[PDB]
Design a protein around this ligand. Structure first.
Ligand SMILES: O=c1ccn([C@@H]2O[C@H](COP(=O)(O)O)[C@@H](O)[C@H]2O)c(=O)[nH]1
Ligand SMILES: O=c1ccn([C@@H]2O[C@H](COP(=O)(O)O)[C@@H](O)[C@H]2O)c(=O)[nH]1
Lengths: 257, 257
């Protein structure tokens, strides 16, 4: 009874941000999220422009941009609107509710002002979501909960993962899905986004582990692949993004039938 | 066989940052860490100056400072040196090793350039520590692992806490202790720092829970209390800090005998 992305976009309990995403995934035939892991704003923006047609989402770590300004993020939004992708700041909030609300709204980055999506760890308990919600709901944003991680020795397993799923399903006005390595919720209104993806087997020297798009999307049932170095370190990042897009999209189609 | 802070400062396996901290705790009769949870640099610096003699440590969330600059942090270091306290950025790193290394060294905040101590969640597995280490060891810094949290619904319990302790004890060249609600390691070379502290019973409306200094230091065996709103929201923050200092110090003395 698996639904297409475009059908999921219409489910009664779908969140607006999720629906927007699912619609553009279907329209553009992309379930690829670019992990734009660069330190220069010019490179971020050149990647966003060139790769925007190939991606459903651009994931940022704003806190590694050497030359962050709010104006950079304005320019990123312009590209996101032109090419039709969401912006996801991978801030992995992980503090008490009262603190994360301030980290999301304020400081230099003003994350909530430009990020369609953010994510949070579940370790602090559900107050992390309640604090983020206080900023994100008025700003019409969505959140992903980190249910599983791709790295060696991850403790996001077993009952921890189950707790993340319960927390999501209990905060569905704001939580739209997961960071996970597999489908973790049986409810089709939730998105599953999976980092630790490369075409070739391997890892890095600091605990990253890779699996292929066919494995992640096809066998493990996730929705979206998140790819950083497999694209960013390639000479031709546009062709690399196309290879990843095509892999993830066909794995999705084949799982649909 | 409990040792004073000054004796612990001399233990064979003590980390230099821990030893510096323990020595100034003993000298100044303070085991209070101010959680300087403000949005204005001028208020941060005025608090650091006035309260510096009463504290062993000043904990920051740089990402909530509306007017952060590196020069602000230079001024904070001047105060830290004058009054003798460490600076602890409560960044709660919580990503793969390759990413946290960049979040610690780079971006706008350049955390490693000014923070004596940072902290990390253990959820990603030990690569989080290995990545931070690559920046922190050359810069002669230390790290705290988040073994327990103060908030309602925290998943940092049981085997998760035990995993944090094992990860610390296995990375003792860089990890100097814990964020925890109690003593979690039996090894006296590790520091235990405990947030969720107020003199009166209560909590906040976003899952924070409070326990008293006597409970945390005396009964639960921690070393340092971390106090935010119990001080910052008071009219006279200097007298509030003194009340917390005296409470935490006497609880420590009484546990020594
Ligand atoms: O479980 C997780 C959570 C987050 N990321 C993020 O996803 C990207 C993976 O990049 P790469 O390994 O494809 O370069 C990085 O930004 C990393 O911080 C993971 O890899 N794994
Ligand atoms: O388990 C944790 C970890 C971190 N903090 C931090 O400690 C401070 C507690 O402040 P307050 O509740 O005393 O104001 C805040 O900065 C908060 O982010 C906690 O409260 N509990």
């Amino acid at each position: 009874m698996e639904l297409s992305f475009g059908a999921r976009a219409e489910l009664p309990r779908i969140h607006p941000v999720a629906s927007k995403l699912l619609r553009l995934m279907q329209k553009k035939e992309t379930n690829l999220c670019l992990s734009a892991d660069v330190s220069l704003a010019r490179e971020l923006l050149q990647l966003a422009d060139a790769l925007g047609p190939s991606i459903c989402m651009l994931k940022t770590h704003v806190d590694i941009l050497n030359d962050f300004t709010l104006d950079v993020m304005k320019e990123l939004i312009t590209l996101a609107k032109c090419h039709e992708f969401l912006i996801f700041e991978d801030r992995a909030f992980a503090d008490i509710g009262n603190t994360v609300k301030k980290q999301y709204e304020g400081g230099i980055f003003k994350i909530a002002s430009w990020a369609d999506l953010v994510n949070a760890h579940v370790v602090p308990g559900s107050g992390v979501v309640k604090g983020l919600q206080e900023v994100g709901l008025p700003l019409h944003r969505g959140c992903l909960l980190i249910a599983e991680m791709s790295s060696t020795g991850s403790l996001a397993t077993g009952d921890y993962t189950r707790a993340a799923v319960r927390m999501a399903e209990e905060h569905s006005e704001f939580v739209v899905g997961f960071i996970s390595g597999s489908r973790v919720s049986m409810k089709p209104e939730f998105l599953h986004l999976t980092p630790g993806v490369q075409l070739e087997a391997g890892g890095d020297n600091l605990g990253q582990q890779y699996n292929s798009p066919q494995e992640v999307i096809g066998k493990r049932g996730s929705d979206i692949i998140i790819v950083g170095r497999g694209i960013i370190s390639a000479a031709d990042r546009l062709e690399a993004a196309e290879m990843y897009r095509k892999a993830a999209w066909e794995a999705y189609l084949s799982r649909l039938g």
